[PDB]
């Protein structure tokens, strides 16, 4: 079975760290932060890593029953599985698959159904993934809502993410921090079973980021979100499970209608992409172009510079 990547343009693909489409390709230096996302992590032969799961509609969603914290508009969600089964903390994962992998204030809607009559309700809610109340590995997540009365106990409750917010009274774009991992156990202990941090280890090379713009719901948030692999690539590698004939796959970004190669990149076996470039650069590409696997190369392959 020969290795390959999907024939899908950037705009046809989805961010693997938030349920939104991809927008563009971006490269830049990543020496000043730790690049260790847990969503969108998958080896080229189809091994899912970190908290990565297969569908993008499950990224940053929560399910369970909620308990009101008395004297506040906050609720503690006792996490259920995506199945509505009880939560099991003994799985060899950092957190439930699809848990957010950045520190920030994720705003969305908390919906609930009353089992006996089918009555429903929905309220604005925000989860602060950097707080010690965010302990999804321990099976609990705190939501701040607009209500102190409406959500009932022991009823199926779901959080649908929409976007991120920022306190406009502080430095604009100071949050969220997409490269700061949450503490999945509410700051009680180390994160466990993480996908490793990635970094370009070839001179002149930088990471190639698949970038989207998270919706902003309030303030002046940093809405950039970079994933290391499109979700469709994760889905494709999982389905294909093609063996890696080396550590490094050579990809060419190709206009299928003019046949022209605009740049080449390295798809690393462990699941991330590097390009030969120095500095921050938004890649200007024909929207119909796609990535094409050309060959497996050795560790000392020099990429053509990416102008």
């Amino acid at each position, epitope marked *: 079975k020969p290795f390959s990547v999907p024939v899908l343009t950037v705009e046809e693909m989805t961010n693997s760290r938030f349920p939104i489409p991809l927008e563009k390709l971006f490269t830049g230096p990543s020496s000043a932060f730790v690049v260790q996302p847990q969503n969108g992590r998958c080896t080229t032969d189809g091994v*899912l890593l970190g908290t990565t*799961q*297969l569908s993008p509609v499950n990224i940053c969603t929560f399910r369970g029953d909620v308990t009101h914290i008395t004297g506040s508009r906050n609720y503690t969600m006792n996490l259920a*599985s*995506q*199945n509505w*089964n*009880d*939560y*099991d*903390p*003994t*799985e*060899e994962i950092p957190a439930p*698959l699809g848990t957010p992998d950045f520190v920030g204030k994720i705003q969305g809607v908390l919906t609930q159904t009353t089992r006996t009559d089918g009555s429903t309700r929905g309220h604005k809610a925000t989860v602060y993934t950097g707080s010690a109340d965010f302990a999804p590995k321990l099976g609990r997540v705190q939501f701040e809502t607009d209500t102190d009365r409406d959500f009932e106990a022991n009823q199926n409750t779901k959080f649908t993410p929409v976007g991120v917010i920022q306190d406009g009274g502080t430095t604009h774009r100071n949050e969220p921090q997409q490269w700061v991992l949450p503490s999945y156990s509410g700051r009680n*202990t180390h994160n*466990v079973h993480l996908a490793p941090a990635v970094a370009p280890t070839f001179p002149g090379e930088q990471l190639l980021f698949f970038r989207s713009t998270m919706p902003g719901c309030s303030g002046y948030p940093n809405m950039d979100l970079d994933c290391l692999l499109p979700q469709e690539w994760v889905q494709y590698f999982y389905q294909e499970a093609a063996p890696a004939q080396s550590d490094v796959a050579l990809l060419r970004f190709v206009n299928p209608d003019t046949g022209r190669v605009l740049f080449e990149c390295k798809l690393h076996k462990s699941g991330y992409v590097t390009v030969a470039h120095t500095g921050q650069h938004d890649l200007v590409i024909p929207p119909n172009g796609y990535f094409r696997f050309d060959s497996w190369v050795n560790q000392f392959y020099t990429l053509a510079p990416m102008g």
Partner: antibody
Amino acid sequence: QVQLVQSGPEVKKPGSSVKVSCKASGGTVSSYAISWVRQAPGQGLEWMGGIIPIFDTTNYAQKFQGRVTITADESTGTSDMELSSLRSEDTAVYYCARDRVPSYSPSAMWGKYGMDVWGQGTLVTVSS
Amino acid sequence: DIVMTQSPLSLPVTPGEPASISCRSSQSLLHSNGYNYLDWYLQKPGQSPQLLIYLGSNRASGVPDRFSGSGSGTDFTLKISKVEAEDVGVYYCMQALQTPRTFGQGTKVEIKR
């Protein structure tokens, strides 16, 4: 939620066999480890073995290996426990139980932990 | 097999007083994931057993706050802060680390007078 309903009481001669059922009602338990536990009149609780129905993976305590087989329906999780070559010491109440968390998730140690749904029990009397 | 050892085997309790049950394992029940694979079960008279504590110290759903589990490695304790009449029965600890799962002998809790 789901309840485990077991078959009625049994009276067997030694050397015979008995098959006790554990029906899943009001739900499915097929993705959970289902254990069979028995209580002899003089003893406490003893784990005989178990099955994860959707995997058809069984585990049997050494004491019962070769004389007990546990099977189960892949969709409902309803299970059967068949104990053969019965002896007087097999006179006991037999329970089926379900772990509190399933053993499958989408994407030396067996099953999970915390058996929180139990059948009502089945008395098996073995005597000549 | 892991040998589970409970103490005492017979526990008359005064309603309103606390109670404590000890359980020792022949080897450590502490997994690499940081959890102790120890459950507590209660079999009330004439009933099926029911789960009280799982993974050492986690209360099962619906278990009142007066029950608590603690301990680590080979030494565990079930605590009842205030015994009530409805708490009588036989309490079992059980390791879930290795197959076969093995129980303690059971601690029979009855009313002191």
